[model samples]
Target chain A: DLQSLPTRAYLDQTVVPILLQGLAVLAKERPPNPIEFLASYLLKNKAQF
Target chain B: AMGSVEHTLADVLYHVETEVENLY
Candidate 1:
């Protein structure tokens, strides 16, 4: 698809970095509840989206 | 850009989530 490259670029440059950083933070804590951890992280970073 | 960045972000988010599921 013609749109594939733009989608790939955005995910590689933007989404992957943010998710990796947040997942790393979550890994550091080793939270008992990953769902809760991700939910909290989403709230904290909502302004960025 | 062909479309609004919001739409692009939405598309990116959807696809990335699918990819993570594949890894998990």
Candidate 2:
């Protein structure tokens, strides 16, 4: 099954780095409404993917 | 479109599900 999967395909990998770093920033900021915060964060960085 | 960077809930769920399948 894993072999059937794409070995190098990574839309998430392309975009998710932004998420990792965004959450990293979130950890530091600790905003009151965190989900909404990351929503904006990901939207801001969406073009990276 | 929601006057900011807002998409839709259905698309989010769909992408999440699809990505899980991709991970396998």
Candidate 3:
């Protein structure tokens, strides 16, 4: 079996918080670029685009 | 480090629908 940390649990701990922090930073800085679009796109298409 | 964040039932269900099941 893959020794990688369980995705669900790890996401809860790392991914979710990192995602939240990224959003917060974006919310604060309000980056104006295609990267911003990609950010939302990534969230919207988290599993598949 | 931040403390554990409690996900409300709605939050959990929202994640399941939008972020997990639907995405998958």
Candidate 4:
């Protein structure tokens, strides 16, 4: 099943780069609570996904 | 959300579950 999941590889090639860049920016900010921040951020952006 | 980033299974499950919930 793992090998059959091509989406993972495709996302790694495409989305991962942009994701990492945006994450790096957030990382530098060092939010007071990163876990809460990430969950809230993702939920807010879920519609965009 | 409560623990470390290294928590793989729970995080992945939470993400997938939430995605499904939002989809419906």
Q: Which one is best on lDDT?
A: 1
Residue pairs that clash (backbone atoms under 3 angstroms), model 4: none
lDDT of each: 0.62, 0.60, 0.50, 0.51
Retained true contacts (fraction), each candidate: 0.00, 0.00, 0.00, 0.00
TM-score per candidate, chains pooled: 0.46, 0.49, 0.36, 0.39
lDDT of 1 at A25: 70
| Docking quality class, candidate 2 | incorrect
lDDT (tens digit, per residue) of candidate 3 on A1-49: 2336554554564446445544445555666774665477557756631
Task: Tell me the tens digit of each residue's lDDT in model 2 across A1-49.
Answer: 4444443334343554566666666777889999999889989888875
Give the Cα error of residue A17 in candidate 2, in Å: 0.3
Candidate 1 per-residue lDDT over residues A1-49, each given as its tens digit: 4445554565666455555556667766778998788778867885786
- Candidate with top DockQ is 3
For this target, which candidate reaches the highest TM-score against the unseen true structure? 2
lDDT of 3 at B24: 70
> Model 3, B1-24: lDDT tens per residue?
122223332365466546654467
CAPRI verdict on model 3?
incorrect
**Per-prediction DockQ, in order?**
0.05, 0.05, 0.09, 0.05
Write out the backbone clash pairs for model 1: none
**Interface C-alpha RMSD per candidate, 1 decimal:** 11.6, 9.9, 6.2, 7.4
Off by over 4 Å in 3: A1-10, A34-49, B1-24
